[PDB]
Amino acid sequence: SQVLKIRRPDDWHLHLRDGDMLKTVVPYTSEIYGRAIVMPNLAPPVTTVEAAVAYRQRILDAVPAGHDFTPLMTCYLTDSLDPNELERGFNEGVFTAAKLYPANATVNSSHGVTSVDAIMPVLERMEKIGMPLLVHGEVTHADIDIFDREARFIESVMEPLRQRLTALKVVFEHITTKDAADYVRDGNERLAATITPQHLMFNRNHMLVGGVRPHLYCLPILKRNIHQQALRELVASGFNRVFLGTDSAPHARHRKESSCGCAGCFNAPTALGSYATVFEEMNALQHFEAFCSVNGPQFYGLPVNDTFIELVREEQQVAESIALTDDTLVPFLAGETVRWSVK
Amino acid sequence: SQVLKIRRPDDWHLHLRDGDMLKTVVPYTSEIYGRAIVMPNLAPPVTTVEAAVAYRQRILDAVPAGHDFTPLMTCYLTDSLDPNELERGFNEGVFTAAKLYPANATVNSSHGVTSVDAIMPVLERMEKIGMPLLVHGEVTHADIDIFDREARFIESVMEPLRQRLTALKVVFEHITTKDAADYVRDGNERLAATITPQHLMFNRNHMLVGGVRPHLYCLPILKRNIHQQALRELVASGFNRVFLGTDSAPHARHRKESSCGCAGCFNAPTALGSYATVFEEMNALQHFEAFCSVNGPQFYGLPVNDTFIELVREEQQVAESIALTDDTLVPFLAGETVRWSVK
Ligand SMILES: NC(=O)N[C@@H](CC(=O)O)C(=O)O
Ligand SMILES: O=C1C[C@@H](C(=O)O)NC(=O)N1
Ligand SMILES: [Zn+2]
Ligand SMILES: [Zn+2]
Ligand SMILES: [Zn+2]
Ligand SMILES: [Zn+2]
């Protein structure tokens, strides 16, 4: 019965992959979102303007007729990246931002950044030109417990970085901790964050109690409930430097359900409705549009979308699976009911 | 190459399952261990003398010709269990011990315990007759974080229970925390513990960094490294009320590598050599025999085995999998080169 009309949203953190997987997954995004930040962790990674131009075209090829969707491309920072390559792509309208993957922190990150010190000239160029830095904020030393890697990053990397480059705009991507929530809340107008649906909806118990659930396995790892609760409070408060970033991160079923399952939730089909449920549960639907459709554009200095969509509070069962050319893709909340759906 | 000779060990915590699976797994235990505590969590559970007698015979049927193996049976404690049935089984030599799994208010009285207070009659009977209680010490309330469940059990159940029944003998099964190591270390002659090879060798980072590894998923869940180190220090100290219990807990590959992986490591094939590796790394091989072959017998009031086995420090590859009638079993350390093996 209940209908909620919002300005058309965007997705400020998305993985579209490539090849047949890209063809399968892009329509789940392009039918809803006006724009998406397209992450660059392909294999090999997108580290040049030419690679980004071609990838953008493969993405557009896969967008159904009638969807008005614009992919916003990013550069994968490496230790050896030429600042001129990065700036040229920014100047040509190819790169909207650049993504910092700590080496070996996450999916397709073996070529990532080994220290902020190795890439200072690149960061200094971004600061000069007003290019936002997107950060997967985790440390990677083998002896640091996985649940501590986000908090430890704040103290040891994020804060020194921001103190050195005071004009640099930073998005703390997919935050998962009270530590990061407080850090962002207490930050200045050059610091923002994205939050996924899964880090709002669940905590680590959901992944580990009654069985191990690899379709909830993603990075940064789901945390303790008190962290979940801090994230829900942050979005529900109306704080305007948090915004929608799904981190939809698809892997074939048997890559997820294996002896060493890949990290990432394929949440593009269900993310928007899932966010709506959270904001409703937090008695905060008045702030839902801004999170989805206003806060991101403002941080990035881009116009808000000029079209509108509707969500309805009518229960839909999520498909158990989505067909691929080989194997299947298991969506986030597969087989479950979602309370809101796109009209 | 170095030889390590010990009195024949026993396994004080084992899952043998039933039917075809039992036939496959028993030989991995019976070729090495003189005795094992056989856990009662079949479907339906072993809660009667008659069921235990028949299960013992099915186990004996599956022992290869020539192996000198004796299964020591257990009763699954439930709300509906008659204390006269338990006592009769104990008196007749059928039940060596009784096993208490976590309470759950919604469990069927035929299948479990709703609260420990509700089964005081049976626990008092065990105290009276000198029957040891084996405890899976976790509180499984939905609002308790999974990594907190063992520590919560110590405070909420274990200490009050032992204060209430001061003569009751208790094995704190498969301890996984510094909390439990300290508790057991500081206990009296009526409190002991078993420790699995996975909780000595690994911590939660091994299950979750670089991928999710369901073959390391087991209950109680792997904890942070500080806990692992406390366990290693405890066995290494020579403390004589900790002893070998593998918690070998086999599940078919398709039930481990699924959207909801079953808890349990099939470690019977590789456990003994893994414990040798840990004791060696801790420079504590002088305490290895007692852990495997003396401490358990002393606690249970049973004779030490009078035959010997030898481990050799020569590298060997662990099988990638072990065939079942249907599907396959993936052993603990599958495909790895291990340092110690049985001669
Ligand atoms: N988050 C994930 O668990 N996975 C992402 C990588 C990332 O966002 O770091 C992926 O690309 O698969
Ligand atoms: O408590 C338990 C039960 C066991 C099993 O599968 O029987 N597996 C575990 O991992 N621990
Ligand atoms: Zn990331
Ligand atoms: Zn991502
Ligand atoms: Zn157990
Ligand atoms: Zn067990």
XYZ file of C-alpha atoms in Angstrom, chain A residues 15-331:
317
model
C 31.645 -3.522 -9.057
C 30.494 -4.429 -12.555
C 33.264 -6.937 -13.449
C 33.784 -7.596 -17.168
C 32.889 -9.980 -20.020
C 29.771 -12.136 -19.551
C 29.434 -11.264 -15.845
C 29.298 -7.540 -16.719
C 26.545 -8.249 -19.282
C 24.541 -10.134 -16.636
C 24.850 -7.621 -13.767
C 24.756 -4.124 -15.292
C 20.980 -4.113 -15.928
C 20.281 -4.556 -12.196
C 22.021 -1.217 -11.715
C 21.124 0.623 -14.925
C 17.365 0.131 -14.527
C 17.367 2.058 -11.211
C 20.448 4.258 -10.703
C 21.195 7.389 -12.738
C 24.922 6.999 -12.213
C 27.374 4.644 -10.542
C 30.980 4.884 -9.395
C 32.538 1.953 -11.212
C 35.429 0.486 -9.258
C 38.641 -0.371 -11.116
C 39.747 -3.707 -9.597
C 39.576 -5.731 -12.814
C 42.309 -8.229 -13.639
C 44.382 -6.539 -14.899
C 43.306 -3.361 -13.065
C 42.151 -0.170 -14.764
C 45.213 2.049 -14.377
C 45.225 4.055 -17.609
C 42.860 6.346 -19.480
C 42.719 4.028 -22.483
C 41.715 1.002 -20.379
C 39.057 3.133 -18.678
C 37.692 4.449 -22.000
C 37.354 0.904 -23.377
C 35.865 -0.455 -20.159
C 33.330 2.355 -20.143
C 32.263 1.403 -23.663
C 31.904 -2.302 -22.734
C 29.688 -1.128 -19.879
C 27.574 1.073 -22.181
C 27.245 -1.771 -24.721
C 25.578 -3.825 -21.959
C 23.056 -1.178 -20.859
C 19.548 -1.943 -22.190
C 17.901 0.615 -24.466
C 15.773 3.021 -22.438
C 17.938 3.026 -19.301
C 19.544 6.458 -18.750
C 22.617 5.218 -16.918
C 26.060 6.852 -16.786
C 29.056 4.915 -15.451
C 31.534 7.139 -13.588
C 34.940 5.523 -14.019
C 37.791 5.365 -11.528
C 41.535 4.821 -11.613
C 43.177 1.994 -9.675
C 46.063 3.630 -7.814
C 49.372 1.784 -7.931
C 52.745 2.690 -6.382
C 54.149 3.565 -9.811
C 51.136 5.394 -11.331
C 52.160 8.516 -13.283
C 50.297 11.573 -11.893
C 50.019 12.891 -15.491
C 48.079 9.760 -16.520
C 45.666 10.285 -13.645
C 45.248 14.032 -14.305
C 44.797 13.536 -18.077
C 41.948 11.099 -17.397
C 40.415 13.617 -14.988
C 40.782 16.425 -17.524
C 39.221 14.302 -20.303
C 36.157 13.448 -18.173
C 37.204 9.783 -18.015
C 38.198 9.429 -14.334
C 35.751 10.752 -11.774
C 37.919 9.567 -8.843
C 40.780 7.265 -7.936
C 40.583 4.223 -5.666
C 43.157 3.306 -3.013
C 43.430 -0.443 -2.380
C 46.001 -1.334 0.250
C 48.081 -4.083 -1.355
C 46.593 -7.519 -0.589
C 43.731 -6.079 1.484
C 40.909 -7.248 -0.766
C 39.674 -8.570 -4.121
C 42.139 -8.030 -7.017
C 44.448 -5.952 -4.780
C 47.862 -7.628 -5.263
C 48.815 -4.623 -7.444
C 47.484 -2.104 -4.908
C 49.248 0.625 -2.970
C 51.984 -0.466 -0.540
C 52.290 2.876 1.221
C 50.773 6.338 1.077
C 54.429 7.487 0.995
C 55.059 5.742 -2.365
C 52.149 7.630 -4.007
C 52.493 11.126 -2.484
C 53.028 12.915 -5.794
C 49.839 11.293 -7.141
C 47.860 12.284 -4.025
C 49.276 15.825 -4.175
C 48.130 16.065 -7.796
C 44.617 14.856 -6.849
C 44.489 17.456 -4.047
C 45.497 20.203 -6.453
C 42.964 19.313 -9.124
C 40.080 18.500 -6.778
C 39.855 14.797 -7.595
C 38.279 12.744 -4.811
C 40.217 9.859 -3.234
C 38.188 6.715 -2.501
C 39.754 4.541 0.200
C 39.383 0.917 1.134
C 40.503 1.690 4.669
C 42.140 -1.429 6.113
C 45.668 -2.308 7.194
C 47.046 -5.664 6.065
C 49.900 -6.794 8.326
C 49.454 -10.538 8.820
C 49.462 -10.278 12.619
C 46.595 -7.807 12.903
C 43.293 -9.527 13.614
C 40.909 -9.095 10.687
C 38.223 -7.434 12.820
C 40.720 -4.716 13.880
C 41.994 -3.766 10.424
C 39.542 -0.931 9.770
C 40.062 0.795 13.167
C 43.805 0.412 12.893
C 43.776 2.083 9.450
C 42.166 5.244 10.875
C 44.942 5.893 13.404
C 47.873 4.702 11.309
C 46.994 5.828 7.751
C 43.800 7.861 7.360
C 44.473 10.542 9.996
C 48.136 11.180 9.043
C 47.104 11.306 5.371
C 44.347 13.873 5.954
C 46.627 15.960 8.180
C 49.245 16.049 5.405
C 46.870 16.834 2.523
C 44.266 19.091 4.157
C 42.510 19.997 0.858
C 42.166 16.377 -0.329
C 38.587 15.112 -0.543
C 38.256 11.593 0.828
C 35.471 9.029 0.778
C 35.949 6.371 3.463
C 34.356 3.548 1.489
C 32.045 0.848 2.934
C 32.634 1.701 6.574
C 31.873 -1.078 9.010
C 32.788 0.189 12.511
C 31.692 2.620 15.199
C 35.331 3.774 14.980
C 34.851 4.872 11.375
C 31.305 6.137 11.972
C 32.543 8.475 14.753
C 35.598 9.500 12.706
C 33.424 10.493 9.749
C 30.758 12.156 11.927
C 33.459 14.288 13.573
C 35.258 15.093 10.315
C 35.200 18.133 8.059
C 33.371 18.764 4.789
C 36.200 17.065 2.833
C 35.478 13.682 4.425
C 32.555 11.389 3.614
C 31.630 7.695 3.648
C 29.572 5.062 1.908
C 27.753 2.253 3.648
C 26.476 -0.997 2.099
C 23.076 -2.558 2.810
C 24.644 -5.638 4.409
C 26.635 -3.648 7.011
C 23.366 -1.912 8.042
C 21.199 -5.022 8.056
C 23.536 -7.593 9.584
C 26.483 -8.182 11.916
C 28.956 -11.034 12.082
C 26.482 -13.347 13.902
C 24.368 -13.470 10.766
C 27.362 -14.832 8.849
C 28.524 -17.396 11.482
C 25.666 -18.552 13.762
C 23.876 -21.743 12.682
C 26.309 -22.191 9.793
C 28.891 -20.283 7.817
C 27.223 -18.103 5.163
C 29.671 -17.176 2.398
C 27.133 -14.967 0.631
C 27.457 -12.625 3.645
C 31.250 -12.852 3.494
C 32.656 -9.587 2.231
C 35.312 -7.020 3.094
C 35.630 -5.158 5.280
C 34.381 -8.059 7.364
C 31.018 -7.800 9.122
C 31.596 -6.670 12.663
C 30.148 -6.953 16.133
C 26.572 -5.774 16.671
C 27.582 -2.535 18.377
C 29.339 -1.513 15.168
C 26.240 -2.334 13.134
C 24.185 -0.229 15.526
C 26.544 2.771 15.156
C 26.246 2.569 11.378
C 22.427 2.493 11.569
C 22.480 5.491 13.948
C 24.770 7.416 11.584
C 22.548 7.061 8.506
C 19.381 7.604 10.584
C 20.698 10.840 12.138
C 20.477 12.695 8.812
C 24.244 13.279 8.730
C 24.772 14.501 5.157
C 28.257 13.179 4.367
C 27.181 9.530 4.252
C 25.638 8.157 1.102
C 24.581 5.112 -0.807
C 27.358 2.810 -1.983
C 26.218 -0.777 -2.456
C 29.628 -2.365 -3.011
C 27.674 -4.845 -5.093
C 30.468 -7.350 -5.716
C 29.325 -10.407 -7.688
C 31.025 -13.786 -7.810
C 29.763 -16.981 -9.430
C 28.032 -19.325 -6.950
C 30.779 -21.947 -6.760
C 33.421 -19.252 -6.303
C 31.499 -18.216 -3.198
C 30.631 -21.764 -2.071
C 34.092 -23.352 -2.133
C 36.942 -24.312 0.165
C 38.102 -20.685 -0.076
C 35.146 -18.487 -0.841
C 35.490 -15.056 -2.484
C 34.541 -11.881 -0.635
C 31.601 -9.812 -1.902
C 27.786 -9.550 -1.778
C 25.818 -9.306 -5.060
C 23.335 -6.817 -3.644
C 22.421 -4.633 -6.679
C 19.047 -6.387 -7.173
C 17.968 -5.802 -3.556
C 20.020 -2.926 -2.143
C 17.604 -0.010 -2.554
C 14.677 -1.826 -0.892
C 17.015 -3.034 1.832
C 18.172 0.495 2.572
C 14.498 1.590 2.699
C 13.724 -1.125 5.287
C 16.623 0.083 7.481
C 15.629 3.762 7.356
C 12.012 2.779 8.075
C 13.100 0.615 11.021
C 15.148 3.549 12.343
C 12.127 5.879 12.011
C 14.171 7.925 9.551
C 12.495 7.774 6.116
C 12.642 11.588 5.944
C 16.421 11.171 5.441
C 16.233 8.313 2.957
C 16.146 10.415 -0.223
C 19.187 12.481 0.793
C 21.250 9.329 1.450
C 20.237 7.794 -1.886
C 20.027 10.796 -4.169
C 21.477 14.060 -2.730
C 24.438 13.591 -0.346
C 26.664 11.868 -2.918
C 26.121 14.395 -5.695
C 26.848 17.211 -3.201
C 30.130 15.669 -2.056
C 31.213 14.965 -5.656
C 30.073 18.401 -6.930
C 27.656 16.868 -9.449
C 24.014 17.764 -10.081
C 21.248 15.720 -8.498
C 19.146 13.542 -10.815
C 16.089 15.210 -12.328
C 13.889 12.117 -12.507
C 12.001 10.265 -9.756
C 11.243 6.649 -8.844
C 8.792 5.027 -6.414
C 9.151 2.283 -3.844
C 6.164 0.368 -2.558
C 5.844 -1.530 0.717
C 4.766 -4.786 -0.903
C 6.643 -7.995 -0.071
C 8.648 -9.609 -2.879
C 10.579 -12.897 -2.625
C 14.126 -12.530 -3.962
C 15.126 -15.082 -6.639
C 17.135 -18.077 -5.413
C 19.544 -17.572 -8.311
C 20.343 -15.656 -11.428
C 21.532 -17.486 -14.527
C 25.052 -17.006 -15.897
C 26.557 -18.594 -19.015
C 28.217 -21.089 -16.640
C 27.133 -21.590 -13.031
C 24.698 -19.214 -11.348
C 24.842 -16.006 -9.406
C 23.275 -16.006 -5.937
C 21.773 -12.658 -5.027
